[PDB]
């Protein structure tokens, strides 16, 4: 996967409330969600405020549980 | 700092050779370098291929040497 696919996977699961509380535009956010527009550093910034544990996975697709860097599938599998 | 500032710090230090060998457009790369255009996931993808140890720092501004995630200033200070 690309960083954009991993970012969009998280973007598709966040609505106006969490986007607004972490300081993003929702209108842009929805256009990124749909694929209409490229994921920028702006979206990465909001996601890493929302999901600080996913910052490594977003950028690289890898995880490091040793330093509290996980992924959505990892957290789901770890419940 | 933002992810865009940290990305541009690395983008400003990479020329056509390393950009091309990791599969990016240089013309876009230079427009991102100058600030003319937003840093996208495309630039993050090339940077994390070039600098896999900086993927966490690019996304979050933090480091984790425990898992080989560093920064430019950290590596320079560690010589």
Numbering used by the authors:
A (entry chain A), B (entry chain A): 2 to 80
Q: Anything the authors wrote about it?
A:
X-ray crystal structure analysis shows that Pf4r forms symmetric homo-dimers homologous to the E.coli bacteriophage P2 RepC protein. Li et al. demonstrated that repressor C, which they named Pf4r, was responsible for immunity to Pf4 infection and also regulated replication of the Pf4 phage by repressing the expression of xisF4. Central to these effects of the Pf4 phage in P. aeruginosa is the repressor protein, Pf4r, which not only controls immunity to infection and phage replication but also acts to regulate the expression of host genes.
The mutated Pf4r, with non-synonymous mutations, will be referred to here as Pf4r*. An Arg to Leu substitution at position 80 (blue spheres) maps to an exposed surface of the protein on the opposite side of the dimer complex from the predicted DNA-binding motif and also well away from the dimerisation interface. We do not predict this mutation to affect DNA binding or dimerisation, but it is possible it may affect some protein–protein interaction with a currently unknown partner.
